[PDB]
Design a protein around this motif. Structure first.
Motif, short mmCIF file in Angstrom:
data_model
loop_
_atom_site.label_atom_id
_atom_site.label_comp_id
_atom_site.label_asym_id
_atom_site.label_seq_id
_atom_site.Cartn_x
_atom_site.Cartn_y
_atom_site.Cartn_z
N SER A 1 0.66 -1.21 0.00
CA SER A 1 -0.01 0.09 0.04
C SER A 1 0.78 1.34 0.07
N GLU A 2 2.09 1.08 0.85
CA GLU A 2 2.78 2.56 0.92
C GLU A 2 3.76 2.94 -0.45
N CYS A 3 3.95 1.85 -1.16
CA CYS A 3 4.97 1.96 -2.32
C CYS A 3 4.21 1.99 -3.53
N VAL A 4 2.99 1.26 -3.77
CA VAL A 4 2.52 0.95 -5.03
C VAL A 4 1.06 1.97 -5.09
N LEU A 5 0.22 1.88 -3.83
CA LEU A 5 -1.01 2.49 -3.78
C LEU A 5 -0.89 4.08 -3.42
N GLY A 6 0.51 4.32 -3.25
CA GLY A 6 0.73 5.95 -2.77
C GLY A 6 2.27 6.05 -3.01
N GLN A 7 2.65 7.06 -2.39
CA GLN A 7 4.23 7.44 -2.36
C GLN A 7 4.71 7.59 -1.22
N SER A 8 5.55 6.60 -0.57
CA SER A 8 5.97 6.52 0.66
C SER A 8 6.98 7.57 0.80
N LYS A 9 7.08 8.46 1.86
CA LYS A 9 8.11 9.44 2.13
C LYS A 9 9.17 8.81 3.32
N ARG A 10 9.01 7.67 3.62
CA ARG A 10 9.78 7.36 4.58
C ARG A 10 11.20 7.06 3.81
N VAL A 11 12.30 7.35 4.62
CA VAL A 11 13.53 7.54 3.86
C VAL A 11 14.30 6.23 3.25
N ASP A 12 14.01 4.93 4.22
CA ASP A 12 14.42 3.78 3.68
C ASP A 12 13.58 2.91 3.18
N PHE A 13 12.42 3.44 2.79
CA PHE A 13 11.36 2.40 2.23
C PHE A 13 11.21 2.76 0.88
N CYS A 14 11.01 1.40 0.31
CA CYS A 14 10.64 1.02 -1.26
C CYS A 14 12.01 1.00 -2.14
N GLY A 15 13.06 0.35 -1.15
CA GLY A 15 14.40 0.60 -1.82
C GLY A 15 15.16 1.60 -1.42
N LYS A 16 16.55 1.93 -2.30
CA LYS A 16 16.97 2.89 -1.64
C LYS A 16 17.18 3.81 -2.95
N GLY A 17 17.45 5.39 -2.27
CA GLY A 17 17.11 6.48 -3.32
C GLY A 17 15.94 6.86 -2.87
N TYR A 18 15.21 8.18 -3.62
CA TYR A 18 14.10 8.75 -3.31
C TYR A 18 12.88 7.90 -3.86
N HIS A 19 11.97 7.47 -2.95
CA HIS A 19 10.80 6.79 -3.74
C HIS A 19 10.05 7.63 -4.83
N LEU A 20 10.04 7.11 -6.05
CA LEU A 20 9.42 7.50 -7.04
C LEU A 20 7.96 6.94 -7.51
N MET A 21 8.11 5.60 -7.87
CA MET A 21 7.03 4.50 -7.90
C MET A 21 7.30 3.03 -8.05
N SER A 22 6.33 2.32 -7.90
CA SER A 22 6.78 0.71 -7.68
C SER A 22 5.62 0.13 -8.53
N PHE A 23 6.01 -1.08 -8.74
CA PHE A 23 5.21 -1.98 -9.44
C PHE A 23 5.34 -3.52 -8.71
N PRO A 24 4.17 -4.17 -8.27
CA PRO A 24 4.38 -5.30 -7.58
C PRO A 24 4.33 -6.56 -8.51
N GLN A 25 4.98 -7.73 -8.20
CA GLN A 25 5.21 -8.94 -9.22
C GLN A 25 4.70 -9.81 -8.23
N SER A 26 4.06 -10.85 -8.59
CA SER A 26 3.81 -12.19 -7.73
C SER A 26 5.23 -13.29 -7.90
N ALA A 27 5.03 -14.30 -7.04
CA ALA A 27 6.01 -15.07 -6.75
C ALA A 27 5.36 -16.35 -6.08
N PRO A 28 5.90 -17.62 -6.09
CA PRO A 28 5.14 -18.50 -5.07
C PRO A 28 5.59 -18.16 -3.90
N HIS A 29 4.56 -18.37 -3.14
CA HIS A 29 4.70 -18.14 -1.70
C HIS A 29 5.07 -16.45 -1.30
#
Ligand SMILES: *[C@@H]1O[C@H](CO)[C@@H](O[C@@H]2O[C@H](CO)[C@@H](O)[C@H](O)[C@H]2NC(C)=O)[C@H](O)[C@H]1NC(C)=O
Ligand SMILES: *[C@@H]1O[C@H](CO)[C@@H](O[C@@H]2O[C@H](CO)[C@@H](O)[C@H](O)[C@H]2NC(C)=O)[C@H](O)[C@H]1NC(C)=O
Ligand SMILES: *[C@@H]1O[C@H](CO)[C@@H](O[C@@H]2O[C@H](CO)[C@@H](O)[C@H](O)[C@H]2NC(C)=O)[C@H](O)[C@H]1NC(C)=O
Ligand SMILES: *[C@@H]1O[C@H](CO)[C@@H](O[C@@H]2O[C@H](CO)[C@@H](O)[C@H](O)[C@H]2NC(C)=O)[C@H](O)[C@H]1NC(C)=O
Ligand SMILES: *[C@@H]1O[C@H](CO)[C@@H](O[C@@H]2O[C@H](CO)[C@@H](O)[C@H](O)[C@H]2NC(C)=O)[C@H](O)[C@H]1NC(C)=O
Ligand SMILES: *[C@@H]1O[C@H](CO)[C@@H](O[C@@H]2O[C@H](CO)[C@@H](O)[C@H](O)[C@H]2NC(C)=O)[C@H](O)[C@H]1NC(C)=O
Ligand SMILES: *[C@@H]1O[C@H](CO)[C@@H](O[C@@H]2O[C@H](CO)[C@@H](O)[C@H](O)[C@H]2NC(C)=O)[C@H](O)[C@H]1NC(C)=O
Ligand SMILES: *[C@@H]1O[C@H](CO)[C@@H](O[C@@H]2O[C@H](CO)[C@@H](O)[C@H](O)[C@H]2NC(C)=O)[C@H](O)[C@H]1NC(C)=O
Lengths: 147, 117, 47, 49, 19
Positions: free
Chosen positions: D1-29
């Motif tokens: 919800s914080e990285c895909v449905l909105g733009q997280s402003k937490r400094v260390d969230f959604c990877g490294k660097g300033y969060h711009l956008m994200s896309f989920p992908q599924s995987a088994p389990h």
């Protein structure tokens, strides 16, 4: 997401690609190319959750460890949601955020051009929107290459 | 702490919609929260552009989005429609009309134009 | 007259976004609503 | 919800660097995320006040 | 329209600056 959004018919997300992110229209599965790789890379011990008694009725029962577990009362239950259903949820999320961005959620999904969606995200970072427009071709290429 | 003693800006915290405020209530063995949120409504599709082309320079929304109906361009905040005339004080000006992709032709209004003389 | 019915699951409902590269949807009204969340805090203490 | 449905402003969230956008992908389990971030580059120093 | 609005002249220096 309770609104399962279809993959948009319009791929004109500025200069951006995303075809390896979005579901593959030619695949029976609703997985994207990257998702299909993720599924191919993780190895599961078995699949389908059905073995008939006759299938292990012989020496073979000692070679098939999962069947050996079944014979001792240990079983494995199927997930309620299937891989296809999950792909449908990720598809909806991608369709939502690629075409409405922030406003796909928290209410009805409201459309917005992709370049604008990023312009607002940049303003959020603290980068003037002018950087994106000036470097729009560069940015799209950096993204497309990163993917 | 973040819903009652402050205003959470986390998108999925304090329920659904945009968080405004909340009030706690106690319960046996727990807490129940009342979360007050804002949900936008009655949206309409307006034509849009990243900038306005004035004298060859590109004008970008200072805030909000530049949108239009069948005859006019105007600027509005994104989360609640309130059309306003695009003026030189409602926009950032830089580059040119050959830089911004999607720039459109609309005269930008200068509020000091009469010069009081 | 009644029976157990097996059926597949729905996933909410089907939807889509127009995604015109020349258009933005903008809210003209809003609703403020209040929803609730229930969270356990403590167990019965025993001895 | 914080990285895909909105733009997280937490400094260390959604990877490294300033969060711009994200896309989920599924995987088994589980879920695998593609996190798109902005990182400034090629700094130069100037005198300041 | 505004509930709680009060009467107070708001300053604007433009004419003195012009002449
Ligand atoms: C995204 O980029 C891929 C290339 O990475 C484009 O697909 C290629 O199309 C050529 C034919 O023109 C094929 O020979 C390649 O095998 C394709 N590659 C892949 C990975 O499919 C794709 O069309 C681009 N999509 C968008 C929306 O720009
Ligand atoms: C930042 O540096 C990059 C290179 O590290 C520049 O992008 C490349 O520029 C060369 C020409 O010198 C092109 O052939 C490449 O195709 C460009 N890369 C991409 C992904 O398109 C970039 O222009 C520089 N940016 C700024 C603002 O100066
Ligand atoms: C687009 O919006 C503008 C307002 O920003 C509309 O202009 C007004 O139209 C009414 C008639 O319905 C006039 O009485 C006002 O004086 C006009 N205002 C201004 C500032 O000119 C315009 O009609 C709308 N256009 C369309 C096609 O709907
Ligand atoms: C959105 O896409 C449309 C095409 O579907 C683009 O329309 C072009 O606009 C230029 C303006 O100079 C015309 O010369 C072209 O002939 C138009 N193309 C077509 C097929 O009619 C439009 O520019 C795009 N907008 C943005 C912001 O990218
Ligand atoms: C705004 O209008 C001007 C004309 O008043 C456009 O500039 C001319 O566009 C034609 C093509 O339609 C070219 O053949 C001329 O050479 C251009 N003039 C000059 C001095 O370069 C301008 O492109 C329009 N801008 C927008 C954003 O639509
Ligand atoms: C945005 O414009 C569209 C028309 O282009 C409005 O109507 C829907 O358009 C889509 C195509 O993108 C169709 O699939 C739907 O079936 C149309 N709706 C109906 C009831 O037929 C759309 O309503 C407009 N958006 C807003 C917020 O007004
Ligand atoms: C900032 O200015 C300094 C001084 O002109 C640049 O060089 C460094 O100077 C410090 C001493 O203050 C040395 O300890 C470093 O070893 C020097 N760096 C190198 C690579 O020799 C420094 O490069 C400038 N920063 C930027 C971004 O240009
Ligand atoms: C500011 O003062 C003016 C008077 O100079 C107020 O206007 C009048 O208010 C009375 C009520 O107290 C009404 O009955 C009159 O009809 C109003 N006059 C006109 C021409 O409409 C004004 O309301 C005061 N504003 C504030 C915020 O205190």
């Amino acid at each position: 997401v309770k609104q399962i959004y279809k993959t948009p018919p319009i791929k004109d997300f500025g200069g951006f690609n995303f075809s390896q992110i979005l579901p593959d229209p030619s695949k029976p599965s609703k997985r994207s190319f990257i998702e299909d790789l993720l599924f191919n890379k993780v190895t599961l011990a078995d699949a389908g959750f059905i073995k008939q008694y006759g299938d292990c009725l012989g020496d073979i029962a000692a070679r098939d460890l999962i069947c050996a577990q079944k014979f001792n009362g240990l079983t494995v239950l199927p997930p309620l949601l299937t891989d296809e259903m999950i792909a449908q949820y990720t598809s909806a999320l991608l369709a939502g955020t690629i075409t409405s961005g922030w406003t796909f959620g928290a209410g009805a999904a409201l459309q917005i051009p992709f370049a604008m969606q990023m312009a607002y995200r940049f303003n959020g970072i603290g980068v003037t929107q002018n950087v994106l427009y000036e470097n729009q071709k560069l940015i799209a290429n950096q993204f497309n290459s990163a993917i | 702490s973040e819903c009652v003693l402050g205003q959470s800006k986390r998108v999925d915290f304090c329920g659904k919609g945009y968080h405004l405020m909340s009030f706690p209530q106690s319960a046996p063995h727990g807490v129940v929260f009342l979360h007050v949120t804002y949900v936008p409504a009655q949206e309409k599709n307006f034509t849009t552009a990243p900038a306005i082309c004035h004298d060859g320079k590109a004008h970008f929304p200072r805030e909000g989005v530049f949108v239009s109906n069948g005859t006019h361009w105007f600027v509005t905040q994104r989360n609640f429609y309130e059309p306003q005339i695009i003026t030189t004080d409602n926009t950032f000006v830089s580059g040119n009309c050959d830089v911004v992709i999607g720039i459109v032709n609309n005269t930008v209004y200068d509020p000091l134009q009469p010069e009081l003389d | 007259s009644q029976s157990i019915i097996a059926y597949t699951m729905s996933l909410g409902a089907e939807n889509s976004v127009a995604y015109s590269n020349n258009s933005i949807a903008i809210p003209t009204n809003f609703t403020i609503s209040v929803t609730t969340e229930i969270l356990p805090v403590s167990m019965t203490k025993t001895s």
